Write a protein that binds this ligand. Sequence first.
Ligand SMILES: OCCCCCCCCCCCCBr
Ligand SMILES: OCCCCCCCCCCCCBr
Ligand SMILES: OCCCCCCCCCCCCBr
Length: 101
Amino acid sequence: KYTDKYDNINLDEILANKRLLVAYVNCVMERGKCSPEGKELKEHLQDAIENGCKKCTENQEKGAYRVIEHLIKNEIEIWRELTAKYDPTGNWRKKYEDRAK
Ligand SMILES: OCCCCCCCCCCCCBr
Ligand SMILES: OCCCCCCCCCCCCBr
Ligand SMILES: OCCCCCCCCCCCCBr
């Protein structure tokens, strides 16, 4: 089971501040420095894609959808690079895009 120690981080504040959001994106894309939380996310994202969040907490599932919907609607280029890197066979791309729409 993934740790819940970072589960009280306010995702709304991150999504509303481009500088904060880009820091996490560059970390997960393996082109920028990581915060402790960013490193933890980077280290579990591939696994979560392979098993549909089987080890995610309820807060992580809810938070993943919040972040993903925001990217699909407002940061298309970021969404595309993330899904291409972590989900190259497209297990979830159409499913999340359909929900967002
Ligand atoms: O439940 C919250 C734990 C994860 C803490 C990191 C939040 C990062 C959210 C921004 C992700 C941007 C796409 Br890489
Ligand atoms: O259905 C595929 C899920 C895609 C999003 C997975 C988010 C994984 C969150 C990992 C949290 C680790 C603590 Br920082
Ligand atoms: O095709 C699926 C690609 C999934 C990439 C989205 C990663 C965003 C995860 C954010 C984690 C937040 C949980 Br608090």
